[PDB]
Nucleic acid binder design. Structure first.
Length: 88
RNA sequence: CGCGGGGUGGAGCAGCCUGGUAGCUCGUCGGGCUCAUAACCCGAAGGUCGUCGGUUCAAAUCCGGCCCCCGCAACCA
RNA sequence: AAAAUG
RNA sequence: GCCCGGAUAGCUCAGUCGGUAGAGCAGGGGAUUGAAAAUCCCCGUGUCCUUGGUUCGAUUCCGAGUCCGGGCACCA
RNA sequence: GUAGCGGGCGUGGAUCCCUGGAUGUCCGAAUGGGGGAACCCGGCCGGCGGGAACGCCGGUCACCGCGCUUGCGCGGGGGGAACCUGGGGAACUGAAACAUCUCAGUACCCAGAGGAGAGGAAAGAGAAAUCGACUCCCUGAGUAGCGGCGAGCGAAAGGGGACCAGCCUAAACCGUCCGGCUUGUCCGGGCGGGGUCGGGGGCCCUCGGCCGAAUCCCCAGCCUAGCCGAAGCUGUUGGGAAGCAGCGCCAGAGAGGGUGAAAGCCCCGUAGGCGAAAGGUGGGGGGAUAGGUGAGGGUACCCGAGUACCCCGUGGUUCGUGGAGCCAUGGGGGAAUCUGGGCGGACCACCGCCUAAGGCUAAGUACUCCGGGUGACCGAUAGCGCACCAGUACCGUGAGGGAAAGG
RNA sequence: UGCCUAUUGAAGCAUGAGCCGGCGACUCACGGUCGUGGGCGAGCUUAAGCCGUUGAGGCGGAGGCGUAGGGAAACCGAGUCCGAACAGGGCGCGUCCGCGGCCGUGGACCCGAAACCGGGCGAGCUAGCCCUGGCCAGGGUGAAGCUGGGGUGAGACCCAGUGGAGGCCCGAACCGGUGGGGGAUGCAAACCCCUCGGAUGAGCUGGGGCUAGGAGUGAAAAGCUAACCGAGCCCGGAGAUAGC
RNA sequence: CGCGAGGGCGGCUGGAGGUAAGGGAAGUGCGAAUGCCGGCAUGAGUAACGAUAAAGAGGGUGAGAAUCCCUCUCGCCGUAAGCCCAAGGGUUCCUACGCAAUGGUCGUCAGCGUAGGGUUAGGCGGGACCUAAGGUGAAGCCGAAAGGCGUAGCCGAAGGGCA
RNA sequence: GGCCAGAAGCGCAGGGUGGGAGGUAGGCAAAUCCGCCUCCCAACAAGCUCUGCGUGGUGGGGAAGCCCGCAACCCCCCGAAGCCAGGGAGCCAAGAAAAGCCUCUAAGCACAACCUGCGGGAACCCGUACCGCAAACCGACACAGGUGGGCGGGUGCAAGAGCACUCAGGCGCGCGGGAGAACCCUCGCCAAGGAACUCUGCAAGUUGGCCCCGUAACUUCGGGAGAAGGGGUGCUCCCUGGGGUGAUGAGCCCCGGGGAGCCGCAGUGAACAGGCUCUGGCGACUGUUUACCAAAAACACAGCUCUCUGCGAACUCGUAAGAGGAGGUAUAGGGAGCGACGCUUGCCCGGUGCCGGAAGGUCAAGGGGAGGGGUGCAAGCCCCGAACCGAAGCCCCGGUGAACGGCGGCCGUAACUAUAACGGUCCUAAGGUAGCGAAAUUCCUUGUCGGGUAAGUUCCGACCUGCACGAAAAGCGUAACGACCGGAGCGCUGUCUCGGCGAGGGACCCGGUGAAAUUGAACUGGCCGUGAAGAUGCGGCCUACCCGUGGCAGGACGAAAAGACCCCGUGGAGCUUUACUGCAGCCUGGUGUUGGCUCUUGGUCGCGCCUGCGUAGGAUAGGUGGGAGCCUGUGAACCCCCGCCUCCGGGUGGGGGGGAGGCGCCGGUGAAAUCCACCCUGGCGCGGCUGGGGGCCUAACCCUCGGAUGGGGGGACAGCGCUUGGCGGGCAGU
RNA sequence: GCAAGGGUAGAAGGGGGCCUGACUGCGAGGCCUGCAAGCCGAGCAGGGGCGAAAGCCGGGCCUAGUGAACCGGUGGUCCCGU
């Protein structure tokens, strides 16, 4: 949907199998349909000033580490690029 | 013409695919109660199971043949 | 506080 | 095909962390009753599924066998 | 583009052809704002007309992304016949029905790249005391395998060739500048130095020896106009000789076209050989910067994290759940730094291979808008839809469709 | 008793053809299998590429057939497999070109669908809705209200007059389309004449806007969505597939 | 001359290419696919000539006129079949010459052909004014990419406003 | 022919508007401007403003008339849909925005700037021909079609934009000329008869305007009403009543009334211009619909009912953001069915659906690990995996009909017979009530009676064995309405017996221009046969000079559409469902986002003490083991008050007096006691680790709050990611 | 044993005693036949039964009582096992 640090979201398939297991008798497959795995997003408000990121919430922590950096710069309204960028 | 359901004591229903035991209510018959009739009470009887045969040790029961009984279909031109 | 007809 | 509970009086079902076999109903004998019920009494009958083994002994405890009932999954 | 007037210019070297420059309305990424493209309306500075109203004229004013104290300086935007990479991604059909499968990761849509794009220096391959970036071709091989084990799909290693190339960083460790803080000899942000690995690097003591750009330059050479180029006369039939008849000749040139018909020697040419003030291009051969140059002995300081790894859901591979690894990765859990970590088809144990989680990297390869050359290629119902004033006329609201016609 | 086609059977009243002239259909690539014309033979043969040529051909053995077969395999071997077996029984000997026939994969002898799918173009027709404007001659009926009179204890209510209501009436414009005739290679790809319905309303109409293809809109017929809509048009997949 | 497909000979036409023996290659042979493209036939001098509002005559011009100009009669529209404005259309406007074709006939005519003219605004209508629906769109929100919403602002008229 | 324009100033009509004087929690405190309060005056005005109309200095224009070219302009009457305009009254559905324009203060400035006057100047861009209800636009055409707005004269008729004629202005429709047949179209008339026509009075006719009489059932009371059925209408002359403008008298128009008298076949003398009635069906009604075969009894409709929805509503669109719902809030929104109004709307929850049920049953991940397996020398690394704990769903229990739906059979019976109020029995979840009823429903069927008719498969009234009505897919009625469907009458008539005549436009002839489908080739006859069974084309026979023109339709299996019916193809589409398989969507557990603090109860391994009342028997012996040859004192023997087991018998610990005491076989019992153990059964009590359920809070997340580094509300839930299972024709492929 | 047919007492019928050949390895030669299936079968080997023996015995008087492959399940074993 976005990603911030991390990165985007794949597009998985499917498996409708109706069968034994291969540990009794065979096991056939009903249908493959195109699924879409959205990237478990989630939002973060942070103190750098009054900032907001949309961390892939598996990296939420990275938000802070990135906050744990006093790059020495007053207002700019966003000051995210530096953050989200002078990041790594 | 074709399907499918059904003929069991007097009437109305079981029992039949799971073969040997015919069950129920009503009424018929006898005896009580009552002045008497009902009602109520006690006790009995009564069926070639539609027919003509087949298979079987044994056929209401299973398989075919008609006889009436009941239902459902009989559409396109 | 009470179980039809002739 | 796996996982569960089962088999006890005619019938429907109980139960000790081994010591008797018991209820409810049907059924029969009696009282009471206008009638028919409901009440009230006394019973009646058991290989506790079949086998072993456990124990001094087993309804019961465990192995195994057959019938019965419940639950779940397959099906080329 | 010839046909015409009407005028003119050229050996005082025109026209023409190559190179560079100049001017280049308006619309179009369109960029002052608007807008029904090619039109309308404005800010600021300056200049024209008597010029204050009006009106011309020249500059200049989009937005977005990177780097300096507020202004700035570099960049971007759109287009391109295919070819290329990525992100998305069908059905018809096939299976003589059909759902897995097939067609197919194709058609198409989107973003991006460029003369190519991609890939690329091993956490590789796979059984070889082995190999040694990648890409392309030939094999390997319709093999191995995959598969309602149907239809059907289908590798890789190894072997031949083409090409040939290797490299920077992150972290230890040292210095420096800056802004925060619990004003602690501390925390992290930015530069510089170091350091790049199958085993190395940092830091301490012990011994010091050069190759070389993928970037900058220069010339060659090659494009972009051109010049030189051999050798035949007479007669004859004919409307017209290049034919025919008789004597010749050139040839590094007997390719071709053209001239009234069939010419080596008529014209343009052909073989062969010269040419650039100018602008492109250009290691093919050479110059110069950048950068890179050793061996032992000790700590046990560094070696890329929400990563590996395990689990759930999927994709790629010949692999369709299979005994199913490996490579990718949305979700959850979640390490270690060489007594580290991955791989060699579940899992162990041996044996061996390789160093993940940062990046760049020529060439050989693909394509044909464009220029040239050939054709047991077409010759005007063919060949391109167009040999001609065609993507036109005409048709359709539009997307779009789409002729005929040569002598 | 025509030609062709299709047929058990056609002059056939079965299909096709007006006539002529052009265009018009068994191909090519790669595998494979027979046959055949050749080279060479226990052997035969090169791929890609390098070198020359500029309509010279060389080189190149990686590789590929063939020389041994049996067996699922281990494995063995002129044998082998099954088996205890010295029974038995099943299997048990060429390449490279060219040309031809036919097979496999490619449309693959040639035309022809109805349809499926992707991406765009369309509401200048038609349906709905939104903004802003217009339009509806003349007649008719005569609601509520007011006002006056009457009525009653007060009221209700009743009366005249006034008044002018309404998916009200007749009927033009305007909108529509009932019945009939005509029209039927039309004046016209829906028209003309007569006759009909509505006509202050759920009205009609100009201009400016919005909604779209399994979607829109729909006082609902599967109607309308640019003259054929039970799923638009255009281009593409595409030479879909066609046991006809 | 060949069984035949064809092959030679000869005569007119034509006027610039052609191609032996013997061989090799194919876009290689048509009468039919309601085939495709073009040409020309049949029906056929047939149906039609587009509203039943209607014509007649005298002069003109002219190569030639029922069909053009003029005149006098007759008839038809007259909430039009008449005037004015929007839209759309783009020179069809006026003038001089003209008739091949275009007019369903004719044509001296024309809305046709060639040429030359013609459109004049502070007050009319638009813009250097205003907003509507709705568009667009700094911010801002959202989407795999395209892109979807959207504040302000801007655009948008037959409505407001102005001599 | 007797007008047009025209400033200021005059008049005449209007439209706008109270004037004061003080205060002030508002207009995002800036206004002396608004807005609100308070009190002197004033009031169906005046004044002040602003329009329209006349008037206006003055300019302009100005026919019919001959040769080929002359110069007024006044007076009444009618009179708007236009103007004054933002006028008035009434009503419910409650009726744009912004700028210009006034006014108020801000910043700033007052040497600016505005306001009124007067003179000089300045004043860009675009459109402007022409067609424009059509031959110039849209329809391939010089197409009988389509196209928005304004003006649109006069007379006549009740009125009018109607109808007839006609001004101005413009047309006579881009082939003509003759004939004078059939037939076709369009049009007129008709003896006698009058629906006999025919599916049907289809069509055509009759009637038609206005004034006056006069009009029934039925009714929701409005209406049925133009009900029906009649009479009048022209022209001349006489008298007379009110109106409007004048002026109160005259012309001028506007509505009437009463008498005479004239003419025709006829007076709305032509054109416009209803025929009517009785009775059924359906639908309440006006409306809407299949553009191009269906205008309806179909859709809609007010109205009734069921149902969802508490607001960040439900529901719809969208992946999302967001939007619609609605700037609404249950007297509101969404979905469904029925369909004004009247009288009503029965019985059945067995099966399906929906709603309700903190129990049980079953149940996926996941939790859990008894136990087993593969490996190594090992520790280990890996694997399978039982109990048990586990949602929604389903099973199960129950409600529910204006939820889907459903709503019986066979026998007998009365004192003539008939029939059956009564009875018997089988089945059911329950057995169709009211009202209708051979019906838009009835097969038999033209049912059977009545009515209507000379005659009636239709129609109307009746009766029921209702093949197969019936209550909200409503039932039965119903005034009014209908281009709706059926049956009758009257009137009128060519629809008809039965056809005839006449007019025009074609057809026909001449001149000019000149198509189309179709077409194997044609030299293309009849009858009998024959043949693939319907022959111009074979056979036999029979007829027949050659070629045209006007006409008719029997044939050429005539034309046109590769049959729409039927079947076939392992063709296609749309639709359905409890067909298969999916997907959207919705439900659901486990995780992530995700945090504090309590309460509580489970399951687990520990550990800590109890726990165990057969029959003999010192008596509440658990089990086998060790056992001699056993321990109290810090002191038992006995005692009380006490928490605790239990069946009571019989106990498990407390404490002080007290102070000696106390054992092991015993004798029996299947088995023997002191004490130590390890352990079976069950319970209790602290600890580990996991769980579940209840509350409280805030800080994430969410919603809001005069613009918040915040305050309220909600709150670890919701939402969202990943994963589990389920529902699932809403959609897709088959 | 059960449908019909053919066959049959010089037994295929009825009874009795011992048995388990309702074997393992094979299989000449044929029947039938598109394929692939189905059917008969002497004989050899091994190790057995019944009979003194000759001998008979690879199910049943005979013809129906059945289903390719693929995919799996249970066993077993000389095989394979990246």
């Amino acid at each position: 949907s976005g990603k911030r640090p991390i990165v985007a979201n794949s597009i998985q398939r499917r498996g409708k199998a109706k069968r034994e297991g291969g540990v009794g008798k065979k096991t056939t497959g009903i249908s493959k349909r195109r699924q879409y795995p959205n990237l478990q997003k989630v939002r973060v408000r942070v103190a750098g000033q009054e900032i907001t990121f949309r961390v892939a919430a598996s990296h939420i922590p990275k938000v802070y580490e990135l906050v744990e950096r006093a790059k020495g710069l007053k207002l700019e309204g966003l000051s995210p690029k530096e953050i989200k960028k002078e990041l790594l």
